[PDB]
Symmetry: D2
Subunit: 209 residues, 4 copies
Amino acid sequence: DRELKNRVLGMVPQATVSSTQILTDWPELVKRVENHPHVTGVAPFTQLQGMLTAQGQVAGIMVTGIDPKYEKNVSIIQNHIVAGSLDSLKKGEFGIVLGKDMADSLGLRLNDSVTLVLPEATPSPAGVVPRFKRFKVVGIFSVGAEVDSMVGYIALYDASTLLRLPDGAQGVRLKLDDIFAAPQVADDIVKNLPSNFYATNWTYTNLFN
Amino acid sequence: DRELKNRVLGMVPQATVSSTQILTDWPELVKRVENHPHVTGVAPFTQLQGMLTAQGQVAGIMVTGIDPKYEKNVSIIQNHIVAGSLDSLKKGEFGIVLGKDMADSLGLRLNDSVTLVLPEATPSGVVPRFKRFKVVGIFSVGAEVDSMVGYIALYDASTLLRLPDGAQGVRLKLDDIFAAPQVADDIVKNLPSNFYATNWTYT
Amino acid sequence: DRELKNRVLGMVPQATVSSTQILTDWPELVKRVENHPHVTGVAPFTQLQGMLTAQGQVAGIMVTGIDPKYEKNVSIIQNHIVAGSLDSLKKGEFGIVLGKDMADSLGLRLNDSVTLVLPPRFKRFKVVGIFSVGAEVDSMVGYIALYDASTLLRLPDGAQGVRLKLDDIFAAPQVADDIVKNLPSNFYATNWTYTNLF
Amino acid sequence: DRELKNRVLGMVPQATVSSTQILTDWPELVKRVENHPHVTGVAPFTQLQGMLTAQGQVAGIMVTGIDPKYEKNVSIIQNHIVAGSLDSLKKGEFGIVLGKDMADSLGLRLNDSVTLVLPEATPSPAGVVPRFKRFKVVGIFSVGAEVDSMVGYIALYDASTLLRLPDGAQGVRLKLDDIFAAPQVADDIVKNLPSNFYATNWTYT
């Protein structure tokens, strides 16, 4: 199945060069990384974990802040948009692009409201102070059973604004000519970066303790 | 301020004897622990962390499953009920008792619906489990507890955890809070390895 | 480099059928899954995370309890043994097989003592094997006997789940989900496409 | 026994005003907080969790960076020094003050070396990557069974150096005339502080 490989491989972050500090200079990291050997695509990202809620329903979700103009270089989500468009993800508009199954679970259609809730630790007995922000559905995708029910996309700078941070990115995502070269490439790139940077790759994965 | 002291000290779990395995036999643990020297009150508990949501609002909360017939021996919450009653917390009714500030923040009044959300860790990251509850009581003690803590039926707590009827542990009230470390450690010393002690001096 | 692929791909768990309850019946789970379409290898596993310490050095480690007779059906670690043997991983002996870089970081050689630290709980092991695969895994993972893993957890002899090797890694999400669909609620699927929160 | 109560209560952090950002300006926070009603003592602190290693032994430890001149206003550890001195905790000298039980478990005496290990998170399956620093035992205290085996003290600015941070404090610890005023006071102080500050108090279990 040639399409299955592109569906699975298109959704896996092959490698990232990430930072513990928000990168307002992320486009210089893109230019610095794009010409590294084996790199065929680069895009900024910020990875958030939270819940969506609407009309009494709650669903877990992993939200990635993206720039759609770059995201085409690493993703296939733009090829599987069933309603709306990724290009509606703009700073300050607080649109969100959801998977078809996720949107169905919450009774959501295009242009419907949905609340994004992010947990935030606190030493108080409550344990969490949730930060919640209202979003509008501007896109719906349909890729695969797993991804359709767990992941959503928002504007890159709405992701940082939700974090009370300046406009920037957590890191850049890499697409490669050989996914099995992802460990070496990310390790090599990080070697010449300052200590705030670190590498991830798709081989990083379920503890019983 | 003697009133301030009782409100603050009345809400502190002075010591617990807790278990990593659900205790379906907890009433015998209560009578056995209640007779220990310096112990003046014992009550079962199961402590949950989650969020409440209603009408688009969400708040973090620490929920304790309790048995009201026992809970008055260790707590002062029964002395500060402003509406409803702790005695409405019975198994299977899925009532909840909230602080006045928390209820107002969610626009909740007595007998209103509110959804409790508990996060479950997912390898894929949270598959939240949510359940509708009914506000059956409202208390008013202090600014912190009124906005952070709630109470449900002991066996509703274990049912939310998909467990048999039981308790996570028992809370102890003592004649002298500075005796809390010794008493809890003494009790746990002769219990099997699933038991452990906590006390208020470890934060 | 076809060898680079074999080193990288050989070390990733492509799919698992795991359980929130230790599986004392894991060989029955193996027989049920090994003939599933696309499945070319099955082995039990139990995954623990902790630290190793020896002579004042400390390293984080991901520990997998394994049965070497099965593990060769899913792994390539047996092809890169530099010292000792995976066959020394037997119940109750508390051997451990380490990567070369981690062993160096702790100043460990064959038959040396090393202490495992789990959330602190301590248990001493004996180095019975050393492997050399690739830079990352050589410094991060170790293997112990399956039932020593469950013993550390104060559990009866069993496995956390079974690891699958497939003819097509891109079938892993579908294959693992299909297997788990008719299993009771304690079972759940994982696959390599599960991957860094800000 | 009033000695037991003074030992237990003297070791409880009644309240803190802490920050998610290292406080290089912490002394102004002290002066700003010390005259708040009910406050009888303020001291900077930085809280570290790690392990100690010496002579083949390993022990978990909660390490607090302190400034001894201030810490005497909030602590009783200075009243139970059995060996050495807290005044030897100075920046860049990397002394440590240990409880007697911890020292006995590692076979440590005064001026012996001991290694502090801090587990730093990493996304790799290794989970942690340890950071190591050699310390010298410059003091030993004996208060009670729990703290003597779990808590140690280092210089404030040595703690921030271990964290690869500039000289500063994680927060200030408050001592009050009435411990039951601690929740209200710390919450009141934080209300007039920017959003990087948060309060803790001893009722947090």
